[PDB]
Amino acid sequence: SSIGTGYDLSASTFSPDGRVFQVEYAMKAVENSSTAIGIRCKDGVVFGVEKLVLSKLYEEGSNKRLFNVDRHVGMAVAGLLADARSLADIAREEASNFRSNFGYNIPLKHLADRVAMYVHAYTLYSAVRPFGCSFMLGSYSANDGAQLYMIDPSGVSYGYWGCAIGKARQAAKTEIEKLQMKEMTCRDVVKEVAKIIYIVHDEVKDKAFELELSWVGELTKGRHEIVPKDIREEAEKYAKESLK
Amino acid sequence: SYDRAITVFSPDGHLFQVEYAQEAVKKGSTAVGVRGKDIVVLGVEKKSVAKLQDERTVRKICALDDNVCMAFAGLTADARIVINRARVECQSHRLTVEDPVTVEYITRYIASLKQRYTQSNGRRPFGISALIVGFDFDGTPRLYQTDPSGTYHAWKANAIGRGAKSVREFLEKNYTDDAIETDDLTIKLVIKALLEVVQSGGKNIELAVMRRDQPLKILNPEEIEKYVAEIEKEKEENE
Amino acid sequence: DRGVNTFSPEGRLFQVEYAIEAIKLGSTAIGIQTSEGVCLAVEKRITSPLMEPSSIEKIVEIDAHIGCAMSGLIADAKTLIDKARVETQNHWFTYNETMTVESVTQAVSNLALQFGEEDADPGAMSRPFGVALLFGGVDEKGPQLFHMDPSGTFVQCDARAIGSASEGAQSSLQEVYHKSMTLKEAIKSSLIILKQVMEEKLNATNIELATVQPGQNFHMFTKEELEEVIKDI
Amino acid sequence: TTIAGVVYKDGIVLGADTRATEGMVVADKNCSKIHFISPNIYCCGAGTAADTDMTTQLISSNLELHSLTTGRLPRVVTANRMLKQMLFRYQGYIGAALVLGGVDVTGPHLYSIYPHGSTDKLPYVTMGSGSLAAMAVFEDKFRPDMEEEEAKKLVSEAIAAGIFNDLGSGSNIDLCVISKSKLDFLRPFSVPNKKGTRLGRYRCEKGTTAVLTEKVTPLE
Amino acid sequence: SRGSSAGFDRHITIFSPEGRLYQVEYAFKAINQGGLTSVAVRGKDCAVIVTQKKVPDKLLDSSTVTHLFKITESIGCVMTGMTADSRSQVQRARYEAANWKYKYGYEIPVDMLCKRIADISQVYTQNAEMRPLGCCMILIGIDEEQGPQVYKCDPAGYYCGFKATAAGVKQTESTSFLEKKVKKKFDWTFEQTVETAITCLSTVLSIDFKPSEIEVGVVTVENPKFRILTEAEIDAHLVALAER
Amino acid sequence: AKRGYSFSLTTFSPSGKLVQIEYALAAVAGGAPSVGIKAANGVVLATEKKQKSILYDERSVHKVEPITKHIGLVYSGMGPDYRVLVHRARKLAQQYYLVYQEPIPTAQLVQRVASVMQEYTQSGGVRPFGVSLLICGWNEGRPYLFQSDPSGAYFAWKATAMGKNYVNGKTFLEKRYNEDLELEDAIHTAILTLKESFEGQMTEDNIEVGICNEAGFRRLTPTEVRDYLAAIA
Amino acid sequence: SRRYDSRTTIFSPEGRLYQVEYAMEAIGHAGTCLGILANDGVLLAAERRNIHKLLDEVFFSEKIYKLNEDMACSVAGITSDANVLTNELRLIAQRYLLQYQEPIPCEQLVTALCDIKQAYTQFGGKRPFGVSLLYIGWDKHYGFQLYQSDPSGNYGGWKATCIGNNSAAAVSMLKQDYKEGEMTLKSALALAVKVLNKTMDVSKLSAEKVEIATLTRESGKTVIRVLKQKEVEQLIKKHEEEEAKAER
Amino acid sequence: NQYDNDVTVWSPQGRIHQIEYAMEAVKQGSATVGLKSKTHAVLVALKRAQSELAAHQKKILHVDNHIGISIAGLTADARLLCNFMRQECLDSRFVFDRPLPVSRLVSLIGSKTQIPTQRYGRRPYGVGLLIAGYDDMGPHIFQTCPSANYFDCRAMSIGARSQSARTYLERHMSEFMECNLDELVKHGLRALRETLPAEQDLTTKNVSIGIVGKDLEFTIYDDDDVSPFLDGLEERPQ
């Protein structure tokens, strides 16, 4: 599955076997970046992204891979952070235009569909290249409940109970299979999300990482918020103790 | 709209599209013009007309204004565009400035027109050189020449086209105060220069004269052969 | 074949680097900044004695207080000088004052990397300007000299040489120039170095000299007053 | 101008006069006001005469483009929506008062389109200058589910009422009967008005007019 | 020559020496990249759609993963191929269906909806700027004058009416299965058309699948509204098959 | 976001042939056979409507398409490209009727359709059509028949054949076609020319035929095709 | 985008345009077309390439196009690109008639189209028109005229010229027989048949294979007519008997 | 080999070479050091000269009263982004009257630089910037690359031989927070000195300092204004 001369240069060009390699190489860009997880619970969604520390000089909180699309919508990104921020701005504007026209908070199933259409629009032309990043969306409300969606460089959106994207997406998904996220409360999920990243993290290939987590459920009244210093370190303590 | 870069720089530091346009002007017919005391005269060589063609349409000498005329070399399709664009500018100058257009101003416009086409997207360079001839309001004779790149220079005597180097070296040895003494001797200097490259001239030569008060005068083959008979008469006397 | 805005593995644009190579084929120009003025010297380089030497102008005035010397492709330079002349008059119309030498140079430096194929106007630039410029003038800060190249990197210079023999002339300027020299010495030194780098011998109808001083406006040296400093060979 | 339409048991009968006036002077004595839209839908016209013709012909052109792509008979609602949206965009500057009537797969449908872009679906509608005189006949004699000949008599009396009582209307009565299988385009249904023939002719004698210059040009 | 190439006939949508469009031919192979098969069968009373519903892991939300789409209340379709391109063609189909009812008054027929999508996909075939969509749409719905209608559009731009159709990897094998059923005279009722559709996907692929492994959508004369059967009704048809 | 190519894809070869047009003419040659015959009393157009699967609905999509009340079209080659040419021919016919209030002449419509086909051989970023068209019509009490190819050229024919084995069709046509044939006789000789290159029995669904006369252009119903097909009349 | 670009408006190392010269090769394959000037009139003569048994023949001409009341042209090259150029020539002629209220001079109409053809060769990135055009007409300034057009936008006023297949051999044959300022329309038609018969692939010459149109000023009005087959048959037979009279 | 011509073309490894080549432009320009404390943010930059007769290049540019930058790479691309940063700061003062926060402005650069990296025929901005700013949250040091990705850092140095400066800042990173204004700058020059070889040290002509914070607005020190900072230097550690 490798073509050298032609077929893989333009996003508007099909290969002899019927594949678009320019999208596939953008999917290889997200494979080289660190793992980003997100598990849907009974009363919300919990995100967890490992941030590889390139230099010790950078401030804690820099290169954030957790974004606020809407006041109720969260965004966990993986891949090239340059394209991740641009898709965040488009997602923010899509949520802004919905409230301006109809007057209520945008449903996640509609928001994930509208952004994925914008992602897809960059995979058919030679003038533009596909986004080299994959991202996740999560929200909680009274009527819709807990919802989680994932969108890849191609422009495909699906619902998830627990998804992972990055370096070891296969190794992370095997850890979520053991969990009972259908019955578990999101307070217990933060405790379990933290320990998966520590197991997945390759500390002999990579140096050191910084843990980043996010709330979005009934605990935070529907609003997507960042995990407080008290709860994050309490889940981080369990992550190190369960490793032994 | 077509926005591809046509003229681009090269590893050595040359603009090939400009250089190839300079190869197109060399392949064209020869054109020589000299500056005299009272009259400025330009002439074209290698007409190579099949004699079965009307020689009124293929005239390379074109008057831009009442006091400005030009002769070209190379791609005749490209020059016809430039001539017409320059002819509009002569009238456009009059609408903004009530004074008639000078030789130096019209040459600067043609050069800048050629320069913009060597830098704009989708456009190719003009493959022509123009010999701009005329008189100023003071009455001082002028001779200018342009090139595909867009550079203009004033000359006393210059040639462009095929065998341009051969006529230039001839003019470097011939152009003196005695050569441009009278009005007839200025015209005789052109024909003597034309016969150096052209294969047995007489009918293959077309030249126009203009005075500092009188309009452009296109001389007929009956008048040219009068000088041809005179030049060869003095050429016979030496041997 | 590649695009015009393509980066090299080295870390620079191709079209810009080739435009620097285009200057090395052009004629040489020497500019010296003095405490009592700025002088500009350039060779005309006459190909044939039939061509008029007065027609070849490589030093032109932008304003009454700023002169400019050009090297490389003359055709492309006249577009930059014309744009610089408008900018000085646009500033005069709006602010009722003459621009500083640094500001005029900065205005031309803005048209450096404004070339491209896509996402551009129908009549936009496709290639960089292969011209090296020497902006010499006097403002409220005093006599100043600036150097500009196709990349758009402009800097103040005490003595700068640009053209064919740029390396040979610059080394000669390094051993002669000092801070407290006179304008007459600046014109003298520039001419001795100019004849060393030339292929054809120095003559009155072969060179261009222009001086901008705090006393008077932009001055172009005529054939008569040129021979006054040529007699001191 | 007096135009009217009716809906009976089988189809639709459309009525129109033939008087066209320039100000207060009759320009045309015999003018067609029932216009072709499709082989099943016809439309009466009122208001600005130049606007009536070009608005009709454009929709008739678009529906022929529409019917050939679909491969089936065009609907009356399609003709209505095309006239409604196009007249609304011009904010009533195109003075076109229309009575749309045609037989569809669904059945008979009658519409009245105003120049501003408002449509009304009714069993009977009247438009034009003599619309008030024509409606008075309908509001007195109309009954649901009529026979073809009974419906033809009602519209003809309605148009005639606008002919004699209104100065803007006159001359012949035109009727267009459209059903599920039959289409009757009776151009001169009734001619109530007749010119009193010239009993005393004033024919000019040959050579009574003075001529100054004469030129004759032969033809092939 | 039979298989000759000259210039860029395999990179952009231009003619080959024989007169074949390679980029268009590669788009049909992009349909088979999904690894799914769709079967459509038309009866005298109903139009039936049946497609594989592959759920590789428990992490995915099963309800979100669907190839059945609703365009109008009376018109539905199924998508086969690239899911990113599939959703883009559905959103366009929903636009053309709504625009028809606004401009022309009456509801769009299935015949005209498929023709419109085929004309849009033709632009991709003639223009070199963009690649054709690597997806296939099979539309179902009842025309209020003619009856049940089944239509299918190609990435090439070919559209046609059908008595029975198939799309995907097992397309050419399943089309042969429908031919044997059509040749023999059958009384095509609601239960007859559904069971023929399910057995076709069950004999070619050889699985004998569960109710959660397939998705069925029908449009009947009494109920012209597009309806998805779901796991509750699909299982009822499956247990009735293992009888004769 | 998209832009669009401005350069032509169809260009001249060193030999002097347009490469993309000749390949488009190769595309039409590998299509279903289509015949058209003028009879001085009417026009007849017949094409191969092979479905080769049975599963397809034969009455759904038509190859013979009407443009107006008196003009129709029959093609060979690619289906999708033909459909766009139909809509364009239908729109150009209506644009003439809105201006001149007269049914468009057949000779005039072909000129307008071929002009569109000429564009796609010269316009930016587009390939030519892989379709050759047979246009029929009736105006001024005279029947008409034309042929328009990918290049944009149009020819007037009495009787011609397209698709696969067009060389065998025309040679059979010049052997059978005669001037002053009746409309009913024209259909018989048109349905026989299609049998020359067919194979696998003719049924009312296997071919499609349309007629044009003083009454206007209309497609013949499968019931009418059935009678003209059962060996005898 | 630049990878798929053919680059049509670009100079070559030798200082020539490739796409124009390749379009010149396209015209050399087309039918033989010649036009010659006479004292009392002017005519065009073209080789009809559309020759088949089942061709309908509806139009007045195949390659001869009427542009103005006093002007007509002929075509050599691609027929499709010619239909666009001839239509443009009809528009320019009418724009001049609307503006000045007098017929457009012959030289002005030729230069107008050649400006458009020059534009395609300089900017746009599109293929040039592979059509050579021969114009015949009359104006009140110079009289009867003949012009030749090139894909590059190059024009020339001729007295006797040929373009198309065997153009180089035909122009030398026209150089042999033509007499300057003495040729009448009667002797011109005999000369045109003489050249067409010799410089042709299929000789013998028939009426269907050739097309001749004449332009003559009569009674203060320009008359443009295409000669019918019976009129052409007589001109061929007059040269055919000259072939038999040569052997004596 | 063939994927290194356009930004739109992806590498089989999952990379864009044209962005990577644009990053090489930053490494070729001279090094500059940017560090912050609790009240101040200082930019120390090294100047280059093509010849000894020519003056030294400008390295620190004005943006606003509270925001300043130090560039590394292409000069024309530096001024083009600087004009954008100046315009966005002017728009905020025109509309909201309040000075635009540093975190907002850096996000605007990450939005503008992302556009050309995705379109055909467009190039990334070949210049790296170190942004010093002070708002109602404290001092800020921001790093921007040719790629739209930006960094919020405590101390950073980018340019030629800037790795030696990067090692010094990492060992003294905990010291910066409680540093005096005079001491904070001295840490900046000592980092900039590590980039240069043991043959030469810092002088008044090639050192530029830009200081912004609570005490004063953004000010650039050049020749005679830089000498109070240079005096009292710790001797060269080879």
Interface test with chain A among H103, H115, H118, H168, by most A beta carbons within 10 Å: H118
Q: How far is CA E60 from the centre of its chain?
A: 24
Q: Do chains B and E touch (3 or more CB pairs under 8 A)?
A: no
Question: CA dist D135 to D142, E78, F217, Å?
Answer: 10, 54, 43
Tell me, yes or no, whether chains C and H touch by having 3 or more C-beta pairs under 8 A. Answer: yes
Q: Which residues of F touch D69 (CB under 8 A)?
A: 87, 90
Chains in contact with G via at least 3 Cβ–Cβ pairs below 8 Å: A, B, C, E, F
Length of chain A: 244
Structural determination approach: X-ray
Pairing between β-strand D108-113 and β-strand D119-121 as defined by DSSP bridges: antiparallel
Chains H and E are in contact, defined as 3 or more C-beta pairs closer than 8 angstroms: no
The closest CB to that of F98, out of D61, D68, D71, belongs to: D61
Task: Compute the C-alpha angle F203/F206/F212, nearest 5°.
Answer: 100
Between CA G27 and CA F12 the distance in angstroms is 12
CATH number, domain of D98, equals 3.60.20.10
Q: Which residue has the tokens 């640009």?
A: C162
- Whether E96 and E113 have beta carbons less than 8 Å apart is answered as yes
Q: Is E122 on the interface with F (CB under 8 A)?
A: yes
Min Cα separation E100/chain D (Å) = 10
Residue type, G185: L
Whether chain F has a CB inside 8 Å of the CB on E153: the answer is: no
Asked if the C-beta of A177 comes within 8 angstroms of chain E's C-beta atoms, the answer is yes
Which residues in chain B have Cβ-Cβ distances shorter than 8 Å to C114?
none
Chain A / chain F CB contacts < 8 angstroms = 10
Please say whether the beta carbons of A3 and A15 come within 8 A: yes
Break chain G down into helix, strand, coil percent, rounded to 5: 35, 25, 35
Residues 6+ apart with CB under 8 A from B123: B6, B116, B117, G9, G122, G123
Tokens of G121: 């060769």
Burial of B155 (0-12, 13-18, 19+ CB in 10 A): buried
Question: DSSP states of chain H as a string?
Answer: --SSS-SSPPPTTS--HHHHHHHHHHHHSBPEEEEE-SSEEEEEEE---SSSSBPPPP-EEE-SSSEEEEEEE-HHHHHHHHHHHHHHHHHHHHHTSSPPPHHHHHHHHHHHTTSTTTBTT-----EEEEEEEEETTEEEEEEE-SSS-EEEESEEEESBTTHHHHHHHHHSTTTGGG--HHHHHHHHHHHHHHHS-TT----SSSEEEEEEESSS--EEE-SSSSHHHHSSPPPP--
A–F contact: 3+ Cβ pairs < 8 A: yes
Which residues neighbour E240 within 8 Å (Cβ) at sequence distance 6 or greater? E191, E195
Q: How far is D72 from chain F (nearest CA, A)?
A: 12
Residues of D marked active site are found at 1
Q: What is the nearest CA distance from A91 to chain H, expressed in angstroms?
A: 14
Beta strands D25-28 and H60-62 are unpaired
Read off the tokens for C89: 């008059």
SS3 category, G5: coil
Extract the tokens encoding A150. Answer: 């994932």
Among C229, C222, C194, C219, which residue's Cα sits nearest to residue C39? C219
Secondary structure letter of residue A129 according to DSSP: P
Q: Cβ(F180)–Cβ(F16) under 8 Å? A: no
| Contact across the interface for B77 and G171, Cβ inside 8 Å | no
Q: What is the DSSP letter of D74?
A: P
Q: Which of D89, D109, D90, D92 is nearest to D100 (CA)?
A: D109
Cα–Cα separations (whole angstroms), residue G99 to A97, A133, B88, F178, G67? 54, 63, 19, 52, 17
Task: Scan residues 156-175 of C and list those with Cβ closer than 8 Å to H.
Answer: 156-160, 170, 173-174
Residue C228 contacts H where some CB pair is shorter than 8 Å: no
Q: Which amino acid is at F193?
A: T
Alpha carbon distance B200, B212 (integer Å): 32
Q: How far is CA F168 from CA D105, F135, F158, F165, in A?
A: 47, 21, 17, 5
User: Contact H76/C108 with Cβ under 8 angstroms?
Assistant: no
Cβ within 8 Å of residue E237, ≥6 positions away: E191, E194, E195, E198, E216, E229
Question: In a 3-state reduction of DSSP, which class is residue A99?
Answer: helix
Angle between helices E110-126 and E83-104 (to 10 degrees): 120
Rg (C-alpha) for chain H, rounded Å, is 18
- Domain span holding position C163: 1-233
Using an 8 Å CB-CB cutoff, list chain B residues near F7. Answer: 2, 4
Q: How far apart are CA E175 and CA E164, in angstroms?
A: 8
Enumerate residues 6+ apart whose C-beta is below 8 A from B117: B123, B124, B125, B126
Amino acid at H63: V
**Domain total in chain C:** 1
Separation in Å, CA C111 to CA A144, C60, F232:
56, 19, 83
Q: What is the resolution of this structure in A?
A: 3.2
- Crossing angle between the packed helical segments C183-197 and C223-230, to the nearest 10 degrees: 90
Q: Are B52 and G159 a contacting pair at CB < 8 A?
A: yes
Give, rounded to a whole angstrom, the gap between the first and last alpha carbons of chain C. Answer: 51
Kindly tell me the burial class for residue F188, based on how many C-beta atoms sit within 10 Å of its own C-beta (0-12, 13-18, 19 or more): middle
Is F3 an interface residue toward A (CB < 8 Å)? Answer: yes
For chain F, say whether E155 makes contact (Cβ under 8 Å).
no
Query: Would you call F124 an interface residue with chain E, using a CB distance cutoff of 8 Å?
Result: no
| Closest CA–CA distance from residue B233 to any residue of chain C (Å) | 28
Which of these CATH numbers, 3.20.20.10, 3.40.50.10310, 3.40.50.300, 3.60.20.10, describes F1-233?
Answer: 3.60.20.10
A 10 A CB-CB count for C168 gives 14
Neighbours of chain B (3+ CB pairs under 8 A): C, F, G
Measured between alpha carbons, how far is H104 from H88 in angstroms, rounded to an integer?
A: 10
Strand stretches in chain E, DSSP E: 37-42, 46-52, 68-70, 76-81, 135-143, 147-153, 159-161, 164-168, 214-220, 227-228
Q: Residue B183: give the domain boundaries.
A: 1-239
CA distance H9 to chain C (A): 13
Cα dihedral H8→H9→H10→H11 (10° resolution): -150
The full set of domain ranges for chain F reads 1-233
Q: B72: Cβ–Cβ under 8 A, 6 or more apart, which residues?
A: B28, B31, B60, B62, B79, B82, B83, B128, B129, B130, B131
Q: Which tokens sit at B210? A: 């203009």
Residues of chain F in contact with residue A121, where contact means CB-CB under 8 angstroms, are 1
DSSP bridge pairs for D109? D102
Residues 6+ apart with CB under 8 A from F184: none
The residue among C5, C7, C34 with the most chain H CBs within 10 A of its CB, best to mutate, is: C7
Q: Cβ of B109: how many Cβ atoms within 10 Å?
A: 19
User: Which of A12, A15, A156 comes nearest E129 by C-beta?
Assistant: A12
d(CA B80, CA B77): 6
* Contacts of residue E72, Cβ cutoff 8 Å, sequence gap at least 6: E94, E97, E107, E108, E141, E226
DSSP assignments along C201-220, one per residue: PP-TTTEEEEEE-SSS--EE
Residue D57 and residue D13 in contact, taking contact as beta carbons nearer than 8 Å: no
CA gap H155, D88 in Å, rounded: 65
H81 to chain C: which residues are within 8 Å by CB? Answer: none
**CA C189 to chain centroid:** 18
Residue A217 in 3-state DSSP? Answer: strand
> What are phi and psi for residue A45, nearest 5 degrees?
-135, 140
Rounded to whole angstroms, how far apart are CA atoms B31 and B162?
9
Task: List the CATH code of the domain at E1-244.
Answer: 3.60.20.10
Asked if A119 contacts A153 with a C-beta cutoff of 8 angstroms, the reply is yes
Q: Hey, is G141 helix, strand or coil?
A: coil
Give the count of domains, chain B: 1
**DSSP codes joined into one string, D126-164:** EEETTHHHHHHHHHHH--SS--HHHHHHHHHHHHHHHHH
Domain A1-244 classification at class level: alpha beta
F212 vs F94: CA distance, rounded Å: 19
CATH number at residue H8: 3.60.20.10
Number of domains in chain H: 1
Provide CB contacts within 8 A for G60, sequence distance 6+. G226
Q: What is the CATH number of the domain that holds B77?
A: 3.60.20.10
* Residue C95: φ, ψ to 5°: -115, -5
Closest CA to H126 of H107, H110, H145, H151: H145
Q: E84 is written with which tokens?
A: 């990113």
Interacting residues of H184 by C-beta distance below 8 A, sequence separation 6+: H35, H37, H40, H42, H176
CB E242 within 8 A of CB E235: no
DSSP state of E59: T
Sign of the four-CA dihedral G188, G189, G190, G193: positive
- F81–E165: do the CB atoms touch at under 8 Å? no
Provide the chain A residues 138-157 that lie in CB contact (below 8 A) with chain E.
Answer: 148-149, 154-157
Which among B145, B126, B9 has a CA at the least distance from the CA of B75? B126
User: Tokens 């199924």 map to which residue?
Assistant: E78
Q: Which residues contact A79 (CB under 8 A, 6 or more apart)?
A: A29, A30, A33, A131, A132, A133, A134, A153
Contact list, F67 vs chain D (CB under 8 Å): 68
